[PDB]
Design a protein around this ligand. Structure first.
Ligand SMILES: CN(C)CCN(C)[C@H]1COc2ccccc2-c2c(C3CCCCC3)c3ccc(C(=O)O)cc3n2C1
Ligand SMILES: [Mn+2]
Ligand SMILES: [Mn+2]
Length: 507
């Protein structure tokens, strides 16, 4: 089958650079291809094991109300006169239509379902050119609430129990490091590698979705749930029409929709299944996986330099047969720090006592680029704040990000003003003054004492600043002392930010 099709209809809209609709042409050519898929007894065996595990799972329907209350606030309004606000506040219009969409889902297991197609507002930095915008594919809100009724309890319960510790989304960054480090130190001669699929969504075939759905039906589910999950699978997950923002038939989809509820769960599942099958084809020794969508880490016992190199090609051929080839091929590492997945890697520093502490970090290019963008521009995600939060132990987050921004707020008296900020698919109203508790909850107090960072990490950050035009770290130690003292002068809450978030600056 063909991954996508176009009718010719133009997807219309609704240094540092945001991606635009104008780039969507190429993105389109890149994600359209025919899918070759051929499965073996390795794929099957894995599947059977996931099903066994899915059979120990009972899931329940969410009521309309529950699904309504777990619709996110700033999600797209519906083609039927109601906001997501209206959904959240249980408006009779939202609820009534929702019920009819649900009745419609039970009564009809066939008619495809309209999905509105669009381009994403993703910011990026430059390479050595312009990466285009990814295209997001979602159905009407009324349908997205129904999706939650039928599958919310499944997607938030099943994956963890089917994939155990390999399920990446269960982990905070510290927990993720904890798992990756333990895995590593459990191999006599560890070898690991990141894998990632060349536009994964488009590689997800119809069969993968039918397989996925069949993993879902392995759960103990309400009769109505089963029906809506069959029906949603048939009328939405396997495919359906596209339609740009000006209501024009853009063509059709025959692969994963990016903007549905089963996307994160499905990709992780489907990815995990193929990767496990592929481990067994490559004959990798004592293997261990970590899967967040299509981003994958495998840690295993090394079989030798050449043996490992070879087996990774065999691992890739196998993945390819299952329709999932890599963007760039996988490369073996014998050094944990060198593995980048989820755009991030494990690295080391030292806490107050002088104990080694592992923590997650990443190339700071994009975070800085977005933080730049968002300095001259009000933003609904505020990725700068999200990054400070997630990567709070990181040298680059503490010295550049935290520093610059508490300077801007200080100067602009906005140290009490809440900001919307999206992390872990949730949208928080975050008050800057609250960061200490957050970081303490998320990484513990050691995140304010991290020092003596690995020399590789220090270099990468330094390199990165000189590349983007941003002052060296010497400046940021000076500037920080003058943001910290300013705050202590302010007492109470503000002084707590200075005590904790900038304690690294006192000589
Ligand atoms: C010196 N000035 C005339 C010219 C600076 N330009 C080239 C600018 C582009 O702006 C940027 C673009 C992409 C990445 C970084 C920067 C940048 C940042 C970001 C750092 C992280 C917080 C958000 C701003 C800067 C912060 C401070 C400074 C500074 O001049 O001290 C510069 C920063 N830049 C570089
Ligand atoms: Mn990918
Ligand atoms: Mn990926």
């Amino acid at each position: 089958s063909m991954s996508y099709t176009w009718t010719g209809a133009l997807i219309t809209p609704c240094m540092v650079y945001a991606t635009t609709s104008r780039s969507a042409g190429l993105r389109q050519k890149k994600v359209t291809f025919d899918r070759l898929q051929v499965l073996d007894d390795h794929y099957r065996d894995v599947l059977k094991e996931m099903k066994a595990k899915a059979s120990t799972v009972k899931a329940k329907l969410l009521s309309v109300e529950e699904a309504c209350k777990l619709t996110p606030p700033h999600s797209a309004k519906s083609k039927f006169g109601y906001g997501a606000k209206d959904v959240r506040n249980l408006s009779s219009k939202a609820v009534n239509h929702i019920h009819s969409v649900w009745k419609d889902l039970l009564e009809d297991t066939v008619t495809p379902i309209d999905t509105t197609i669009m381009a994403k507002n993703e910011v990026f930095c430059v390479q050595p050119g312009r990466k285009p915008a990814r295209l997001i594919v979602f159905p009407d809100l009324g349908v997205r609430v129904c999706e939650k009724m039928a599958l919310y309890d499944v997607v938030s319960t099943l994956p963890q129990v089917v994939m155990g510790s390999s399920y990446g989304f269960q982990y905070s960054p510290g927990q993720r490091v904890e798992f990756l480090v333990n895995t590593w130190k459990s191999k006599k001669n560890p070898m690991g590698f990141s894998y990632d699929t060349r536009c994964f969504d488009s590689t997800v075939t119809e069969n993968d979705i039918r397989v996925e759905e069949s993993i879902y039906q392995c759960c103990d589910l309400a009769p109505e749930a089963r029906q809506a999950i069959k029906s949603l699978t048939e009328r939405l997950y396997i495919g359906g029409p596209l339609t740009n923002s000006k209501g024009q038939n853009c063509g059709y989809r025959r692969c994963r929709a990016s903007g549905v509820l089963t996307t994160s769960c499905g990709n992780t599942l489907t990815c995990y299944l193929k990767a496990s099958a592929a481990c067994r084809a490559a004959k990798l020794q004592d293997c261990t996986m970590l899967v967040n969508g299509d981003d994958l880490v495998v840690i295993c016992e090394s079989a030798g330099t050449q043996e490992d190199a070879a087996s990774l090609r065999v691992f890739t051929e196998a993945m390819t047969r299952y329709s999932a080839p890599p963007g760039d091929p996988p490369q073996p590492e014998y050094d944990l720090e060198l593995i980048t997945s989820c755009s991030s890697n494990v690295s080391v520093a030292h806490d107050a006592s002088g104990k080694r502490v592992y923590y997650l970090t990443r190339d700071p290019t994009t975070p800085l680029a977005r933080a730049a963008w968002e300095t001259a521009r009000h933003t609904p995600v505020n990725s700068w704040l999200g990054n400070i939060i997630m990567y709070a132990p990181t040298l680059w987050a503490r010295m550049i990000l935290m520093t610059h921004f508490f300077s801007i707020l200080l100067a602009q008296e906005q140290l009490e003003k809440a900001l919307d900020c999206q992390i872990y698919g949730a949208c928080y109203s975050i008050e800057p003054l609250d960061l200490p508790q957050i970081i303490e909850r998320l990484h513990g107090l050691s995140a304010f004492s991290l020092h003596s960072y690995s020399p590789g990490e220090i270099n990468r950050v330094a390199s990165c600043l000189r590349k983007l035009g941003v002052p060296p770290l010497r400046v940021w130690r000076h500037r920080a002392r003058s943001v910290r003292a300013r705050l202590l002068s302010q007492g109470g809450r503000a002084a707590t930010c200075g005590k904790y978030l900038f304690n690294w600056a006192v000589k």
